[PDB]
Each structure stands twice: as C-alpha cells, then as structure tokens.
C-alpha cells in the first residue's frame, strides 16, 4: 500500500523512494528539482521535513 505522493500511482516501484521518518513515497522521476538515481542513505519526504527543528 505505497504510492507517490505527486502522482498518487504505485506501479514502477524500482524508481519510487521510501521515506525513512513514514511511510510515504516517491518516484524518483517525480521528484523536483531533478533526481537521477535512488540514493544510498536516508531520504526524507516534505510531510517529515515539516517535523524537523
Ligand atoms: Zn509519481
Ligand atoms: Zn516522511
């Protein structure tokens, strides 16, 4: 039950990235500004950037 938060699809999910703080997603190709790859370490989503301090 993952989906992208830009598209709301959860289909081609060798390109959609996992947030680390939830469980919310998103496909690389989506993502803005540009993003080539899935990167090694964390990523976190906006809903988790929000929380930060
Ligand atoms: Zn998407
Ligand atoms: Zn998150």
């Given at each position: 039950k993952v989906t992208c938060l830009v598209?709301?699809?959860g289909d081609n999910d060798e390109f959609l990235?996992?947030?680390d703080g939830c469980d919310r997603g998103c496909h690389i190709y989506?993502?803005?500004p540009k993003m080539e790859?899935?990167?090694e370490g964390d990523w976190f989503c906006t809903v988790c950037?929000?929380?930060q301090v």
């Open positions: 598209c709301r699809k990235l996992l947030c989506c993502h803005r790859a899935v990167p950037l929000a929380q």
